[PDB]
Amino acid sequence: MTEYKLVVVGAGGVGKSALTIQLIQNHFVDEYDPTIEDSYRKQVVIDGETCLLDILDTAGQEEYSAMRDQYMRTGEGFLCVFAINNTKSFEDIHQYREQIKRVKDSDDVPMVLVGNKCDLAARTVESRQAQDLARSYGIPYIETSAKTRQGVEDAFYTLVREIRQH
Numbered sequence: 582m583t584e585y586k587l588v589v590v591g592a593g594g595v596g597k598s599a600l601t602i603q604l605i606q607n608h609f610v611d612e613y614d615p616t617i618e619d620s621y622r623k624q625v626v627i628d629g630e631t632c633l634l635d636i637l638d639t640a641g642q643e644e645y646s647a648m649r650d651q652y653m654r655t656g657e658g659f660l661c662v663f664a665i666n667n668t669k670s671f672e673d674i675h676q677y678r679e680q681i682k683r684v685k686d687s688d689d690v691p692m693v694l695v696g697n698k699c700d701l702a703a704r705t706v707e708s709r710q711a712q713d714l715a716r717s718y719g720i721p722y723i724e725t726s727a728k729t730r731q732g733v734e735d736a737f738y739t740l741v742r743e744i745r746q747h
């Protein structure tokens with residue numbers, strides 16, 4: 582069966598782990614344990630196709646930035662996550678996109694931009710701002726809440742549908 586190598590990236594605390602765990606294990610992690618690098622695998626059916634999602638949950642802590650080249654080389658598609666209540670995390674997306682672009686030597690890497698924590702009312706990144714950024718990258722923008730599950734499957738499954746247009 583087809584295997585898809587997804588990599589979840591973004592600044593510390595944006596909810597990369599919560600999103601991945603919600604998708605794979607169907608619960609919300611409330612506590613905050615910073616990630617080094619974890620792997621998850623799951624067989625799912627997406628648009629009639631049985632496939633294997635291999636998901637890499639990466640570090641947002643900048644201390645671990647040296648590990649990025651390795652996982653950007655291997656990954657097929659990237660979920661670029663910021664939090665809608667964290668402007669700096671949105672500004673941090675460009676550094677991720679730029680390094681992906683370098684490592685892949687491509688302006689056409691499968692990616693989805695994800696605005697997470699949409700359940701929180703302390704929004705500092707408006708949907709339109711993020712839509713604009715995604716448009717410049719040629720990729721979709723989707724908002725999610727790992728807490729309520731809103732948009733979680735949509736985000737990861739869309740990343741799969743992007744890998745498929747390539």
Ligand SMILES: Nc1nc2c(ncn2[C@@H]2O[C@H](COP(=O)(O)OP(=O)(O)NP(=O)(O)O)[C@@H](O)[C@H]2O)c(=O)[nH]1
Nearest residue numbers: 593594595596597598599611615616641698726727
């Ligand atoms: N209200 C709300 N909280 C969230 C959401 N997603 C994650 N969180 C919370 O934000 C904190 C950090 O989440 P976490 O998934 O560990 O973030 P991370 O991006 O994986 N952090 P790191 O880069 O250090 O590994 C946790 O307390 C978690 O419960 C969300 O959609 N809504």
Ligand SMILES: [Ca+2]
Nearest residue numbers: 608609610611
């Ligand atoms: Ca919990």
Ligand SMILES: [Ca+2]
Nearest residue numbers: 688689718719
């Ligand atoms: Ca692009």
Ligand SMILES: [Mg+2]
Nearest residue numbers: 597598615616
């Ligand atoms: Mg994490």
Ligand SMILES: [Mg+2]
Nearest residue numbers: 705706707710
């Ligand atoms: Mg503003």
